[PDB]
Amino acid sequence: KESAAAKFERQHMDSGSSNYCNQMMCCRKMTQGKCKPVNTFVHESLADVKAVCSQKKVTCKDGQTNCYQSKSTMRITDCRETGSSKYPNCAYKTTQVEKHIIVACGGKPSVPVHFDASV
Amino acid sequence: KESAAAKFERQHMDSGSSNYCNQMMCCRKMTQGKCKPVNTFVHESLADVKAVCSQKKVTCKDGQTNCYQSKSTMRITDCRETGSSKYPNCAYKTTQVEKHIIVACGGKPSVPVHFDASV
């Protein structure tokens, strides 16, 4: 089965125009069978992201208490479904911002397993 | 089974940055199980491309006799594996060009079933 850690890296990491979300949501499999409504890709280094798991502990949006807020801002891209998006033709809006990210962490070593929010 | 017509649409149609090939090749699943060496995406409408089957008859690179060359030049993007590309990390060099395309047609009705070359 796909690890939560590898799932997070597939859904959220892209360390490194207007169709960026369209092509990446497709490439990273968030349009297989349904359109992931919203998804964030983080461009900081995988190391900088994993380090968020040793940063400020916050409560996840769902109440789980294994969320971690990043101490510094991060280049991320917000992928949000356009109003026309309708599986099997998922279409997204691409927005780039610099924000702190909140991720959930799990496993040993503790790594990010869910992208919770961007402050 | 996936029809040759649909495969051609999944593989070569994208009607409508330098990572474009890395992304699209991944998204249209030509990086799945292996990396497809070379691949072209055509940005003209599906009708223009399907119309090619009624255009100029030409021989195919591979000696077959069911190739047709578009009468008009079309906006296309060429994808070619870069030298370090190696499954599962397929990698491509993106090159946008405006050339006449040559596709192989087949089936009933005769539609594009292979992208043969651009000229």
Report on the structure:
The structure is a homodimer of 119-residue chains. Chain A has 119 residues and is of the alpha+beta class. Chain A has one domain (1-119): Ribonuclease A-like domain (P-30 Protein, Roll), CATH 3.10.130.10. Helix content of chain A is 19%, strand content 34%. Chain A contains 3 helices and 7 strands, in the order H-H-E-H-E-E-E-E-E-E. In chain A, the strands form 2 sheets. In chain A, strands 2-3-6-7 form a 4-stranded antiparallel beta sheet. Chain A has a 3-stranded antiparallel beta sheet with strand order 1-4-5, with helices on one face. In chain A, strand 6 and strand 7 (111-118) form a beta hairpin. The longest helix of chain A has 9 residues, at 4-12. The termini of chain A are far apart. The relative contact order of chain A is 0.25.
CATH architecture of chain A: Roll
Question: Whole-Å distance between the termini of chain A?
Answer: 31 Å
* Rg for CA atoms of chain A: 14 Å
The CATH homologous superfamily of chain A is termed: Ribonuclease A-like domain
The order of strands across the largest sheet of chain A is 2-3-6-7
Helix percent band of chain A: 10-25%
For this structure, the quaternary state is: homodimer
Element string of chain A (H = helix, E = strand) = HHEHEEEEEE
